[PDB]
Design an enzyme around this catalytic site. Structure first.
Site, PDB file in Angstrom:
ATOM      1  N   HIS B 356       0.773  -1.239   0.000  1.00 59.71           N
ATOM      2  CA  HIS B 356       0.000   0.000   0.000  1.00 59.71           C
ATOM      3  C   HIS B 356       0.810   1.299   0.000  1.00 59.71           C
ATOM      4  O   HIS B 356       0.249   2.395   0.001  1.00 59.71           O
ATOM      5  CB  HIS B 356      -0.895   0.011   1.253  1.00 59.71           C
ATOM      6  CG  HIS B 356      -1.957  -1.044   1.235  1.00 59.71           C
ATOM      7  ND1 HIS B 356      -3.167  -0.824   0.630  1.00 59.71           N
ATOM      8  CD2 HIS B 356      -1.959  -2.283   1.780  1.00 59.71           C
ATOM      9  CE1 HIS B 356      -3.867  -1.939   0.801  1.00 59.71           C
ATOM     10  NE2 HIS B 356      -3.172  -2.844   1.492  1.00 59.71           N
ATOM     11  N   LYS B 547      -8.895  13.424   4.520  1.00 63.51           N
ATOM     12  CA  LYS B 547      -7.910  12.354   4.523  1.00 63.51           C
ATOM     13  C   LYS B 547      -7.038  12.581   5.756  1.00 63.51           C
ATOM     14  O   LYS B 547      -7.032  13.677   6.325  1.00 63.51           O
ATOM     15  CB  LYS B 547      -7.038  12.347   3.254  1.00 63.51           C
ATOM     16  CG  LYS B 547      -6.288  13.661   3.000  1.00 63.51           C
ATOM     17  CD  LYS B 547      -5.620  13.701   1.609  1.00 63.51           C
ATOM     18  CE  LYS B 547      -6.627  13.834   0.485  1.00 63.51           C
ATOM     19  NZ  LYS B 547      -6.485  12.719  -0.493  1.00 63.51           N
ATOM     20  N   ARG B 548      -6.299  11.545   6.160  1.00 60.88           N
ATOM     21  CA  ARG B 548      -5.417  11.658   7.311  1.00 60.88           C
ATOM     22  C   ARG B 548      -4.383  12.771   7.109  1.00 60.88           C
ATOM     23  O   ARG B 548      -3.922  13.006   5.993  1.00 60.88           O
ATOM     24  CB  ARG B 548      -4.727  10.295   7.613  1.00 60.88           C
ATOM     25  CG  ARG B 548      -5.655   9.218   8.211  1.00 60.88           C
ATOM     26  CD  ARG B 548      -6.218   9.599   9.564  1.00 60.88           C
ATOM     27  NE  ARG B 548      -5.166   9.754  10.564  1.00 60.88           N
ATOM     28  CZ  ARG B 548      -4.692   8.780  11.327  1.00 60.88           C
ATOM     29  NH1 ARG B 548      -5.268   7.593  11.374  1.00 60.88           N
ATOM     30  NH2 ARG B 548      -3.633   9.017  12.094  1.00 60.88           N
ATOM     31  N   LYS B 553       0.730  13.997   1.882  1.00 61.35           N
ATOM     32  CA  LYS B 553      -0.581  14.362   1.278  1.00 61.35           C
ATOM     33  C   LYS B 553      -0.628  15.881   1.054  1.00 61.35           C
ATOM     34  O   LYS B 553      -1.517  16.318   0.315  1.00 61.35           O
ATOM     35  CB  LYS B 553      -1.702  13.825   2.171  1.00 61.35           C
ATOM     36  CG  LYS B 553      -1.848  12.311   2.214  1.00 61.35           C
ATOM     37  CD  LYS B 553      -2.907  11.858   3.193  1.00 61.35           C
ATOM     38  CE  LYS B 553      -2.958  10.358   3.378  1.00 61.35           C
ATOM     39  NZ  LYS B 553      -3.584   9.688   2.219  1.00 61.35           N
ATOM     40  N   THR B 655      -8.202   6.395  -2.244  1.00 63.60           N
ATOM     41  CA  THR B 655      -9.581   5.998  -2.504  1.00 63.60           C
ATOM     42  C   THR B 655     -10.576   7.142  -2.327  1.00 63.60           C
ATOM     43  O   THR B 655     -11.651   7.112  -2.910  1.00 63.60           O
ATOM     44  CB  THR B 655      -9.984   4.818  -1.631  1.00 63.60           C
ATOM     45  OG1 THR B 655      -9.757   5.166  -0.259  1.00 63.60           O
ATOM     46  CG2 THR B 655      -9.211   3.549  -1.988  1.00 63.60           C
ATOM     47  N   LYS B 659     -14.154   8.467  -4.511  1.00 64.11           N
ATOM     48  CA  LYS B 659     -15.450   8.790  -3.878  1.00 64.11           C
ATOM     49  C   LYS B 659     -15.930  10.149  -4.376  1.00 64.11           C
ATOM     50  O   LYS B 659     -17.126  10.282  -4.619  1.00 64.11           O
ATOM     51  CB  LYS B 659     -15.307   8.745  -2.354  1.00 64.11           C
ATOM     52  CG  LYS B 659     -14.799   7.437  -1.764  1.00 64.11           C
ATOM     53  CD  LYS B 659     -14.437   7.553  -0.289  1.00 64.11           C
ATOM     54  CE  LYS B 659     -13.390   6.559   0.150  1.00 64.11           C
ATOM     55  NZ  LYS B 659     -13.038   6.765   1.553  1.00 64.11           N
TER      56      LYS B 659
END
Ligand code: KDH
Ligand code: KDH
Ligand code: CFF
Ligand code: CFF
EC number: 2.4.1.1
Lengths: 815, 815
Positions: B356, B547-548, B553, B655, B659
């Site tokens: 991942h 998101k985290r 990110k 992911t 969405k």
């Protein structure tokens, strides 16, 4: 067995009722347990039935509590740290008249309901008598239609499961909730905060308890059904939960366990005080959560708390919930803002204390430092209570400074402590012992100064047992033959058993009484074989001593007698003696060394006696493993002789004694506790009463108990002590029982050697009567027939009229 | 609202179905919750409905598992330490076609089912993507008719509940089981032993693991319904329990907590490895209990384990359950007595590993000392595995000692460690990344040596999301307008969404697509007001990054843009800009300092921006508290712009991106992960793609990333850094963000300043298109219509055919 379904006291198997029971049995199996018949075990089948049966409680449970809301009667809160409830399934079925219906329903499904019943774990949330009294009381309170609420703690682990290994007790955790409890309803929505530690700030409007650690109290409510009156009361047990808010995050989450440890395990001490802070926390936890519910319900009824004692009764089961007195004051003064004196008026009228022992090692005396740290505001209140209380002593007895020091709630010494019995007396309008002799002994000794100041406070309430669990449930055969002669009203009116004295010369009753006993004995014998591969002789006299292992209960005295029978057989092998299975059972507290030695001695005697080919089946001594309420229901109906042999003055009441009397055993015992009243009810001629009376114990204490004298004057006794010392009962370890020998010879508080001779000869009288079946059985009839007084219904009716100020009723609720 | 009951994709409200739902709703209220209408809260009503709805699962649950017994297909065991499931109630209703029926049933009872739904706690047993992928996968596996079993741990506490206090994250325990979980079935009867510590004795017939501490593993089974196929699979979550047997007795009982701490809490790390022994214990616990179930089920089917891989697939979700490889070998060799090579043949054919991340701080590398103490026999087996594996390397590449050292399962250094990814590759027949670029990056870098030895092992499986939860559940309005044009088959055949490209010029679809978005936005705006008293402007562009919180990110990049918009407004107040609500949300791991600083910066920017009267409602920046699956279902349907701005090469797949594409947001992002394939599916012309590509990142790394260069060349960027340093966003603490400033200027692994300029200009293009509603909506249609590839049904079908060797089916089971 089909015969059992022909027992009328078990009610009707209505065709539709049966049909519905099966439909719901199969419905729970599918939707609740998510099984089918192909993978279903007995345990699944037990659960399907438990769920099915609990469904019948729900309607009455809701309607009963609404009835109480509507009528608004005075409410009885029975605070106890223990509820020795046992199993619920059979009890539910009997109080709802569903037994024969469920038995027929399960039978048609190809199941034996009796087997299913044996899968249920006991709710063993008690140690012994005090715990089981609380259970009996909840049942009677329901049957008598009282608006009564049991309040205690939902221990994750109850009294430990005892395993005998090498002749020794080992303890294992009683994981009673492993497969779930189908009776209780969790009520997370009604969770309450309980505070610990902290500090007191005396501000403008008074004191404020601040800087406290919070532990949430989560209630689980269990139904408590009365006997066919459509009444279902509530037992509320608090479970400890970490607060919603706050070594790192992981550790903080893990550390939630610390707070949750308060409800983890029952302290397994019977009649013994251990001053552990965790135990103290348990006591405050139950009292704090419980009193918040009482205050709230009081307010949501038809603030002025002058009417609080007209609507609230708090009954303290021992001093274990004593903090309810400082706690009620705390709420009333610090939060409701009442003057101290009105608050104290309310408190005393609301609280009453029940004492269960005169033995010093059992009485609670908490170090002030511990109370100061954990509950600073409570200690402050206790000191204030003590000042005003001692002021009353001073005014009543001017110049008696000696009485002042003796009656103080504060006990001086190397460690200052609070005497919790004294707090209870000061803060309660009623103080009772649990048997006449005990209630007399309290006013003449331990509490004589309090009796002199406030005679009016001191009462007696002789203990009782519920004839539902302890006759109808456990001994259906005996209940039936009784019901055939006098009908069923006696089941909640046990004094009607006196009618059975009309049958002392009826040949069928004599035959039937003996036949039932034989049946119970054959069934118990079979039990030991399947579960423990133990052979017992069913044509032997079943001599049973079951109760917690204790010096004061004198299991040791029983040991001495057993060895006497053994040695007498060896000296005269050819001489006939009445065959006997001596059964001793009970748990020792894990830290009580003598009690663990006593268990080892019983098994050690067995290791000799039971393998001597000269003895054979004439004498057998077995230690009944893991004595608990379920096993009491098996072994007591099977007993011929009830051993109740405490030193006179030591057993406040006893309740096992009453269970044996109710189930067709004759009693061998001292004049101690309710044994005194049992012999008065039956006539001393129908009891094997022996030994020193309390006054005789006193005279010995006056001149000093010298055990040596009895050893030097009694050859049979000296022989036994020599066998113990030299290692006859412990060949591989000759010195193994030196501690027992030493205590008996030099430090025996309970004077075993002084009752040895009278005990042995009294046992000869027992054997003599056993040789005459007809007269044995006739004396048994005289016992069963006079056991009515010992119903807990009578006890509770007395609590209700003489302490709580409520009138009991046996009228059915509409349903 | 009645309109919702007119949504066809929610099924029929059959008159009898409604009638029965209400009867059972009222039945659970009475018998299960023991309430009446007079005391019932919304929470009770939610539970009555949950119980009622779970009843509809039971029949299919039993029949599905019997079907699998009868047909005996190959079984898929999806091992994961996380199952980010969210709520179950709505999901149950949609997959069973009960939504409109329940909605009508509750409506007639005077209840709003939407309100009831909001009382359900998330099952938040995951951190983020990897966890939610597992949940999506269970749902798709059920919908595709696979004999598939999710296996993980029932954490007592899931991902922490985040509270923002003072602009800062605080963590509170996620007590998700406080009021019970009505979906799961406890299975204490199927409890299994797991062993820890101990020692290895190599005896006659081989090795023996002895002297071990036992922890019991108790399974709880939760139903997993497919989409209207009458299939209900099982998620089995293990709960840790102290063994039945054994500072004293009390302490011993208390100490049962230690063992029970293994299932207490999810380690809240997203994409970060922490070598805590408790975490390692969690990993072994799930693998040991799970593999005992697999072996037993294998044996109870139609020992020779040559057919084990024909009947068993074990899929490893990351290296977290890696010990399944040494564990399977251990069972096969030490207990089943198979030769090592046959055992290894079986193991490799049975196990497959999904990777991942390529980020080093996320990869598991356990100290050998820790493995030696806790799992001695596993370490032995790992060493043996490593020898035979490196022997194959040696034979394939003679003389490449460099490859040997690089490919070793054992990593040398001050602390020797086992590389768990290497073990997985060696012990698995299939290794996959979760997006094309990531699967390519693995064979060219991190795993290139393994790709060269065994090319055939390495696959791609682009991640997916379930269109049940992530469209039908969360966005019923959008599902409906889609269903009006193309019918309902797309719900389990999402590639049918391409049919919507026929509507790019249909005025009603264009109108309807925009209308639904407006509705979702008004509803979300209303949500913030009631629950958090937060005002947002519903005629603003909803710019959402959820998101985290992570450096990689680049929430920080988003911060820079937000401040740019603010400063541009101040320089030219009179100049029109498209109004925007910038919404950033996500949790920081409790020990990740930069992430907690980033959260504080977002709120700190808000403290300036949102109170500047020159800005007013033109710009608003809010931090969405406690982002979790339930909140994703609310905010994503409401979003206009999806922020997917990871540094190229860092986000393996994502992911959340899928969405947003499915729910009518346009995407602003780098060419990273599935963003690459999303733009290929839609056309790059329909994505706001900006920034460095992976190869550009590499060239920077080759010559060194000097942040100073961008600061010295970009005036707008230098201004922002000066505002941060000097304390414009932290007046009371000017130095508060120095750590952020320092990392950006000197230690930024993710090159935020290098994408700053292209990002800012790309955002201008976003605003420009937003000024043209019609063309915004038309580009949205082009996105929704090409989102089909990103269904988890496609992902799973690929797993099934390319790794597991099973053919998926969408045929209904009889019911
Ligand atoms: O050992 C038998 O019961 C055990 C002893 C016993 C008792 O003394 C009094 C009582 O209230 C109940 C009671 O349940 C015991 C029991 C234990 C089991 O494990 C069991 O499956 C069971 O059906 C029962 C038994 C033997 C029998 O031969 C028999 O026909 C029977 O019905 C029962
Ligand atoms: O704030 C409203 O809902 C919240 C936001 C929201 C959403 O964005 C998407 C979604 O899938 C569900 C959803 O549930 C939210 C919600 C929260 C509650 O506490 C609640 O009682 C409720 O009924 C619902 C709301 C306002 C409304 O005015 C309204 O009519 C309505 O039906 C709902
Ligand atoms: C000395 N002692 C103990 O130590 C004890 C006990 N009950 C429990 N314990 C631990 N009793 C009754 C007792 O006399
Ligand atoms: C440095 N660091 C952490 O310390 C960390 C983390 N995730 C969790 N933690 C604790 N990440 C991603 C990280 O880079």
């Amino acid at each position: 067995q089909e015969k059992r379904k022909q027992i009328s006291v078990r009610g009707l198997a209505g065709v539709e009722n049966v049909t519905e029971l099966k439909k719901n049995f199969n419905r729970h199996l599918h939707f609740t347990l998510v099984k089918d018949r192909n993978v279903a075990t007995p345990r699944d089948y037990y659960f399907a039935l438990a769920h099915t049966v609990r469904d019948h409680l729900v309607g009455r449970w809701i309607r009963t509590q609404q009835h109480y809301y509507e009528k608004d009667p005075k409410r009885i809160y029975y605070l106890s740290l223990e509820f020795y409830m046992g199993r619920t399934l059979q009890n539910t079925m009997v109080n709802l008249a569903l037994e024969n219906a469920c038995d027929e329903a399960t039978y048609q499904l190809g199941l034996d309901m009796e087997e299913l019943e044996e899968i249920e774990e006991d709710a063993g949330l008690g140690n012994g008598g005090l715990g089981r009294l609380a259970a009996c009381f909840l049942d009677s309170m329901a049957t008598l239609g009282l608006a009564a609420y049991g309040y205690g703690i939902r221990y994750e682990f109850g009294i430990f499961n005892q395993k005998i290994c090498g002749g020794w007790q080992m303890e294992e955790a009683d994981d009673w909730l492993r497969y779930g409890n189908p009776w209780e309803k969790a009520r997370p929505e009604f969770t309450l905060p309980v505070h610990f530690y902290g500090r007191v700030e005396h501000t403008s409007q008074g004191a404020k308890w601040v800087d406290t650690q919070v532990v949430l109290a989560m209630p689980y409510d269990t139904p408590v059904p009365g006997y066919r009156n459509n009444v279902v009361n509530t037992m509320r047990l608090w479970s400890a939960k970490a607060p919603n808010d706050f070594g790192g995050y992981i550790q903080a989450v893990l550390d939630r366990n610390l707070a949750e440890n308060i409800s983890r395990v029952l302290y397994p001490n019977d009649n013994f005080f251990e001053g552990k802070e965790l135990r103290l926390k348990q006591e405050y936890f139950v009292v704090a959560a419980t009193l918040q519910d009482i205050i709230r319900r009081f307010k949501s009824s038809k603030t002025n708390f002058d009417a609080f004692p007209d609507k609230v009764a708090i009954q303290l089961n021992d001093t274990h919930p004593s903090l309810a007195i400082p706690e009620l004051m705390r709420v009333l003064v610090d939060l409701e803002r009442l003057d101290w004196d009105k608050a104290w008026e309310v408190t005393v009228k609301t609280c009453a204390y029940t004492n269960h022992t005169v033995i010093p090692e059992a009485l609670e005396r908490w170090p002030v430092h511990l109370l100061e740290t954990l509950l600073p505001r409570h200690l402050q209140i206790i000191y204030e209570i003590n000042q005003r209380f001692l002021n009353r002593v001073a005014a009543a007895f001017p110049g008696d400074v000696d009485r002042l020091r003796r009656m103080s709630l504060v006990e001086e010494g190397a460690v200052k402590r609070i005497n919790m019995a004294h707090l209870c007396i000061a803060g309660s309008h009623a103080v009772n012992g649990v048997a006449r002799i005990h209630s007399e002994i309290l006013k003449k000794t331990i509490f004589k100064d309090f009796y002199e100041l406030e005679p009016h406070k001191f009462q007696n309430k002789t203990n009782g047992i519920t004839p539902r669990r302890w006759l109808v449930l456990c001994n259906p055969g005996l209940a039936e033959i009784i019901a055939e002669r006098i009908g069923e009203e006696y089941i909640s009116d046990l004094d009607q058993l006196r009618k059975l004295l009309s049958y002392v010369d009826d040949e069928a009753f004599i035959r039937d009484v003996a036949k039932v006993k034989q049946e119970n004995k054959l069934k118990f014998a079979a039990y030991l074989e399947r579960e423990y591969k133990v052979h017992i002789n069913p044509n032997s006299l079943f001599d049973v001593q079951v109760k917690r292992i204790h010096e004061y209960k004198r299991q040791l005295l029983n040991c001495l007698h057993v060895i006497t029978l053994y040695n007498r057989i060896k000296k005269e092998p050819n001489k006939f003696v009445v065959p006997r299975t001596v059964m001793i059972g009970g748990k020792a507290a894990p830290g009580y060394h003598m009690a663990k030695m006593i268990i080892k001695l019983i098994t050690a005697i067995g290791d000799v006696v039971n393998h001597d080919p000269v003895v054979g089946d004439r004498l057998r001594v077995i230690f009944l493993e893991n004595y608990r309420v379920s096993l009491a229901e098996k072994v007591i109906p099977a007993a011929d002789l009830s051993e109740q042999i405490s030193t006179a003055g030591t057993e406040a009441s006893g309740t096992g004694n009453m269970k044996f009397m109710l189930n067709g055993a004759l009693t061998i015992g001292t004049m101690d506790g309710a044994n005194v009243e049992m012999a008065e009810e039956a006539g001393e001629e129908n009891f094997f009463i022996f030994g020193m009376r309390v006054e005789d114990v006193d005279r010995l204490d006056q001149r000093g108990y010298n055990a040596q004298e009895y050893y030097d004057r009694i050859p049979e006794l000296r022989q036994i002590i020599e066998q113990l010392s030299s290692g006859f009962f412990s060949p591989k370890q000759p010195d193994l029982f030196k501690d027992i020998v030493n205590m008996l010879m030099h430090h025996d508080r309970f004077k075993v050697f002084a009752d040895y001779e009278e005990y042995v000869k009294c046992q000869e009288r027992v054997s003599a009567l056993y040789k005459n079946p007809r007269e044995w059985t006739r004396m048994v009839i005289r016992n069963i027939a006079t056991s009515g007084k010992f119903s807990s219904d009578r006890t509770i009716a007395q609590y209700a009229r003489e302490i709580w100020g409520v009138e009991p009723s046996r009228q059915r609720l509409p349903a």
